[PDB]
Amino acid sequence: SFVPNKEQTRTVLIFCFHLKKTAAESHRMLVEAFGEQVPTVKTCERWFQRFKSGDFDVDDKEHGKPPKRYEDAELQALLDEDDAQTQKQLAEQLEVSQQAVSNRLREMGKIQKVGRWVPHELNERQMERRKNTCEILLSRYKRKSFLHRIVTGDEKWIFFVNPKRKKSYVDPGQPATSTARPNRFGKKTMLCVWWDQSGVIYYELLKPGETVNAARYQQQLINLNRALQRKRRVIFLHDNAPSHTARAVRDTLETLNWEVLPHAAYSPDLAPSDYHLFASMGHALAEQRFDSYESVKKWLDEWFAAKDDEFYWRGIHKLPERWEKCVASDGKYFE
Amino acid sequence: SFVPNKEQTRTVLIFCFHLKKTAAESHRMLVEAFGEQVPTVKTCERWFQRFKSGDFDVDDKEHGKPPKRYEDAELQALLDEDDAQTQKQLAEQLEVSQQAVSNRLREMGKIQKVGRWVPHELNERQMERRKNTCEILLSRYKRKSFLHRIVTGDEKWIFFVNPKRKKSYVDPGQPATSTARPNRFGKKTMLCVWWDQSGVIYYELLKPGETVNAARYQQQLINLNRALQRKRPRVIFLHDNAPSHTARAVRDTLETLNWEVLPHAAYSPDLAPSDYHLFASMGHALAEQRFDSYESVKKWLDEWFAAKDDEFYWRGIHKLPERWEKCVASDGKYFE
DNA sequence: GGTGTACAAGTATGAAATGTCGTTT
DNA sequence: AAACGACATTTCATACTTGTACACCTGATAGCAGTG
DNA sequence: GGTGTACAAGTATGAAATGTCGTTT
DNA sequence: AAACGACATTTCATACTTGTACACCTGATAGCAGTG
DNA sequence: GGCCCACTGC
DNA sequence: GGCCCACTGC
Ligand SMILES: [Mg+2]
Ligand SMILES: [Mg+2]
């Protein structure tokens, strides 16, 4: 009460062949073993031909199949036109189903990736405006590194709670751990902070209802210089905010005698405070909660000092790497 | 020419056995065929034992293997404690590697899902406050459906651009189509809109710098009644507990019109038809939409309301008591 | 509330594998 | 006997189809301060 | 760059499979 | 001869390991209007 | 003197 | 008859 499959049967024909048996001889032995279920003599005679040309492959040669409605490169053509396109959209153009393409994208090497966020929709001018700033700063950097003289800063919000969506490992069809959504008008503090390649220099922490006026910003610049003179020419870089563009402050920047660096609009990607310093903070801020304003300050103090010096230096000195990219992108958002 | 593998060799022993051959006879035939590469007589004798107990499995019985460091349910225990946990965190508790767990989660049925967002962190009171509203409305619905008499509305923002992140199909290591982030202070319009199970009734479209005061909201309620009287036949009003809505000023106007206000708990957009149904549908139709002007918005709305079935609006209103039951089953909590 | 992707099971394709039977070696 | 040639008949991976599970979306809380 | 998940290639486990050789049927 | 028993020897899926590719995160644009 | 109104970038 | 709270929910 054993029935052999196709493969096992063909192996036995290899065996008989190597035993110098004749085609029909073998067939009679197959029946002596397995009864009448086995193949005709004619197929035994055929396999013997294949063995006489040393083809001991037991698997079938690949059978007929329906021809393809479209080809791999006919789909590839559509992805080069437009990377981000729904499977039903592609399917309509190829005149096949959604499910059809689903497979072919995995028969090809493809995967789904998510569209990276960028700060702004740029003008044709805004680009070349950006491209020039970078170009001109690269010229000057090559003549001499002035990055050891750079002091920068920017202002940024810090919420007392920073919820993030959880990710649960659970059987399919089960729900995940839901999270309670952040109050866009919950408790928060504007952090004004300026820093050298050495470390942080000085910073303030504004309670909401203390707006940033040019009048405030100067007062911060004085207390900045106070700190800078006792903690350490100077080269200033900061975003083109209206408190920063204030004529009031541009006088104060001459009086201090700090050279303002040229900076194009909408370039937080070229603002060390933004791309490096605050970015690091973003991770350390996840799922954090604070009682009070001194709970924030206390956390900051520990967290700044906890970093290397090599940290701060690194983010400042990454500038000219980025300036080159910016120039290579004709002013566009590189990366 | 040809050397046979383990499986092919064992098949031939099945063949010899069925040919009533002796163990050692078969072995001699194996060598006659394939030369001296084949197994000993002793293994042939063994396989014959297995065939005598009808075991014609050719694959090995599964070999020895290193014993498990932890068991499936020892990991399962940790996921019941805390669904959302990183592989390195679990790995530390089991005293195994991250990569180890990666596998065992797929050896088990598991997958990673994202934590659904909910409107608010609720109090113990806020829950039962909500649970009662639902409970009391279910009592009344059972006595008679009053949902054909319901007129509800809410206010919501509409941005002139609504960017969404693209998703690219591309070889691994290639970038995806990046897309430019929305300006939180770009052009926008507050949409104030009220609607019956029939369709939309009336709506206004505020330019920013026209705040919603109780004084405005009454003016909208009048123009609402103006519009409503030019359609239909009592009325039952439902709207979110905003301060313009809670205004004593407006609560007088709601008696004067003689519209019964429905009780509604705080922080329940999940029990607000305008929110969960009407606006939600709009959210999709608003993706990657751009507008020139305010009439561009109105024009799009007009087409888009009328384009819907009646069956649409009705559905969302009548889905209420389904949700009230869930709310009660959750002891007031956010039934996802 | 609506959309997008993948798994499942059904269905044609069509050349390779198989079977039938008079003829050749 | 044993193999063959020419014909009809059948097998099965393939490249699609329609039906459908289910992950994840969607709705949920209004800016400022400069300059001209 | 920081974190989290999955794909490599190397390495032990250990019982099932194999081999050797005097002994039993 | 053929099969066996008792012993030494070897095979291989398995359940881990460390090394590493790479997807996706992170930073970027300040509320209102009631009531007591 | 004042206020407004329309750009500008954070 | 005017304005600054600390609450509140969208
Ligand atoms: Mg800034
Ligand atoms: Mg509302």
Residue numbers in the entry:
A (entry chain A): 3 to 234, 243 to 345
B (entry chain B): 3 to 235, 243 to 345
Article sentences:
Mariner/Tc1/IS630 family transposases are unusual as they integrate their transposons, with a 2 bp stagger, strictly at TA target sequences. The wealth of structural and biochemical data for the naturally active, eukaryotic transposon Mos1 offers a paradigm for determining the molecular mechanism of mariner/Tc1 transposon integration. The 1286 bp transposon is framed by 28 bp imperfect inverted repeats (IR) and encodes a 345 amino acid transposase that can perform cut-and-paste DNA transposition in vitro, as shown in Figure 1a. The Mos1 transposase homodimer binds to the IR at one transposon end and then captures the other IR, forming a paired-end complex (PEC). After excision, the Mos1 transpososome locates a TA target integration site and, upon binding, forms a target capture complex (TCC).
This DNA contains the transposon IR joined at its 3' end to an unpaired TA dinucleotide and target DNA. Target DNA binds in a channel between the two catalytic domains and the active sites contain the strand transfer products. The transposase subunits adopt a crossed (or trans) arrangement with IR DNA in the Mos1 STC, similar to the pre- and post-TS cleavage Mos1 PECs: each IR is recognised by the DNA-binding domain of one transposase subunit and by the catalytic domain of the other subunit, and vice versa. The most striking feature of the Mos1 STC structure is flipping of both target adenine (A1) bases of the symmetrical TA sequence into extra-helical positions. One Mg2+ was observed in each active site in the Mos1 STC, coordinated by the D156 and D249 carboxylates, the 3'-OH of C-1 and a water molecule.
